[PDB]
Design a protein around this ligand. Structure first.
Ligand code: HEM
Ligand code: HEM
Ligand code: HEM
Ligand code: HEM
Lengths: 146, 141, 141, 146
């Protein structure tokens, strides 16, 4: 996926400051709250009854880390994203039949979470670059549907 | 369809916009134009580089048009009928672009009003933007 | 949001649906289950076999829920509260599935009531089903 | 994709009966009516301010029938759809910039026209077969987007 060099520096700089410990959780967590039908896929998790509930769940929060690493994975080498997520594609598409629209929704809630944590540092140019990234990651996740 | 709590969140959080209305709407549009360049094809008659006084201006216009709907929430087909006429019959704007701006607004809001952009609020604003999105892209004259 | 014309159309196309509400609701469900197999997971307890009594009977329920929606086309969130709870609160149905069933309802009606299935009415039924879809997938409490 | 041998025969017997003069035109016309924003991509076409105007619009009829032509080539090349629509893809995606969700819509409207022409002959299993075809074509036209 084609970020410019300055976009690449920009996303790498920012990712460097991310709390690889909570934002994954906030990303997954907001997904479950904002699109409540995605909770269907996590019943083995527990109390998703309230926003405070979902938000404050070691379950949603444990899982998030997995999510973040997959993104960092993707962030690392952005020229073969199809490859890195191949297993996750099979997993999500073949195994869990997650509708691929959902993948775009999570990528966008991640952008939301990043803007939340960086405010004015999450500038329009920097967002524009993360949009290329989450779009890249989403299309890879949904490739087994191809 | 909005709940009572949703209308509550939308007016309580959008209400923190205030003077910044113009700035946010401007920024949200800028974010959309840069992040999703195809959306620039609805604006040929616009100067679109950073600091266009025009984008800044037709930033306050969306923000206030948005201000419109948060208090006439219970009937936007009414309050926004001119805006529907514009977006759905004249320009024929593809609904996908409404989701992009909507997303860009959520970002602008999450960057500027952190204490306010709670998950419950986030959910309510997305619905609100979705619902005004449906109003503006439907021909119901 | 629906227009006047659209409103009378859902009424005038659905007027021709006989006591065939059962057959058609059933055929739409059958069409969904075969065309889009993932939809089957919302019904693990059902007998989904060809000619399934349970499906034919569910067709009827869907078709009469739709009936009631026609009956209060202007008060859907009101009339549909119980089913929103079922579909949005309980079932947690992904909205894409409503697009799939809506489409299959359209195909079914096209197939059986071709005289009614004009372009303008097709347009109206599509808006109508999306609106009941939005009511059914929204948490409005 | 892979239809079964059963599905393959049934789509290749229904298709041999299509009115290659109306169906295309009926599908496109319906697309512009049911989803009016698509009207934006047909500025050079003429009058489209009423359903009646649309369906009898000679440009809609004519182009619509080019469209059916494209689906026809699709049905003949179920194996590599990706390459068969490679040029159409660049056209719609990089020159036209049509949002890909709209490819899915045309595909489904085309199925509706099929139901409309063939009534009871368009059985649920025949539809299931055709849904695989239209999904396949949609994903081929959106291929230069990924
Ligand atoms: C959009 C970007 C996404 C990324 C980067 C991602 C990443 C991951 C990762 C790393 C796992 C670990 C699975 C394993 O190792 O076995 C996983 C599992 C899973 N994902 Fe996602 N995923 C994404 C989207 C989604 C969405 C949208 C949904 C549902 C709405 C979803 C539902 C699930 C479920 C149900 C599991 C298995 C949970 C379990 O272990 O019980 N994923 N995903
Ligand atoms: C929530 C979404 C939107 C709101 C609240 C909104 C509100 C408004 C308002 C108040 C105007 C007034 C323009 C005037 O006074 O002449 C306008 C115009 C316009 N909108 Fe939007 N609009 C929205 C979404 C969009 C989107 C998504 C697009 C396309 C990407 C778009 C394209 C345009 C164009 C081309 C104009 C005409 C500008 C002019 O000629 O002044 N709008 N909108
Ligand atoms: C317009 C769309 C729909 C309508 C109007 C509708 C209508 C109904 C009705 C009347 C019931 C009766 C529940 C009862 O027996 O009290 C029901 C239940 C149900 N629906 Fe829907 N339904 C719709 C869409 C969907 C879709 C798209 C799905 C999933 C793909 C789905 C999954 C279910 C399930 C799993 C039940 C439980 C039925 C039972 O246990 O009796 N529904 N629906
Ligand atoms: C399966 C889906 C589709 C197929 C098979 C298809 C097929 C075609 C074909 C064969 C052409 C002829 C290009 C030429 O003249 O060289 C074309 C052009 C075109 N398509 Fe489609 N198309 C599809 C979807 C769409 C959709 C959904 C839209 C808009 C919403 C669209 C907008 C256009 C436009 C504006 C042109 C050029 C018209 C002109 O020459 O003025 N296409 N497409």
């Amino acid at each position: 996926v084609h970020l410019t060099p300055k976009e690449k520096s920009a996303v790498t700089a920012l990712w460097g400051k991310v709390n690889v410990d909570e934002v994954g959780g906030e990303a997954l967590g907001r997904l479950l709250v904002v699109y409540p039908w995605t909770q269907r896929f996590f019943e083995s998790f527990g109390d998703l009854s309230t926003p405070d509930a979902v938000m404050g769940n070691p379950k949603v929060k444990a899982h998030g880390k997995k999510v973040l690493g997959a993104f960092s994975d993707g962030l690392a080498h952005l020229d073969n994203l199809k490859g890195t997520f191949a297993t996750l594609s099979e997993l999500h598409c073949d195994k869990l039949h997650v509708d691929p629209e959902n993948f775009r929704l999570l990528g966008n809630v991640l952008v939301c979470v990043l803007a939340h944590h960086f405010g004015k540092e999450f500038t329009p140019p920097v967002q524009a670059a993360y949009q290329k990234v989450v779009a890249g990651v989403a299309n890879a996740l949904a490739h087994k549907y191809h | 369809v909005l709940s009572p709590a949703d209308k509550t969140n939308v007016k309580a959080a959008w209400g923190k916009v205030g003077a910044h209305a113009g700035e946010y709407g401007a920024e949200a549009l800028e974010r959309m134009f840069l992040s999703f360049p195809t959306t620039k094809t609805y604006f040929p008659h616009f100067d679109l580089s950073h600091g266009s006084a025009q984008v800044k201006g037709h930033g306050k216009k969306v923000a206030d048009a948005l201000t419109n709907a948060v208090a006439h929430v219970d009937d936007m087909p009414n309050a926004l009928s001119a805006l529907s006429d514009l977006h759905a019959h004249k320009l024929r704007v593809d609904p996908v672009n409404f989701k992009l701006l909507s997303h860009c607004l959520l970002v602008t809001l999450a960057a500027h009003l952190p204490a306010e952009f709670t998950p419950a609020v986030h959910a309510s604003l997305d619905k609100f933007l979705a619902s005004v999105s449906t109003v503006l892209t439907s021909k119901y004259r």
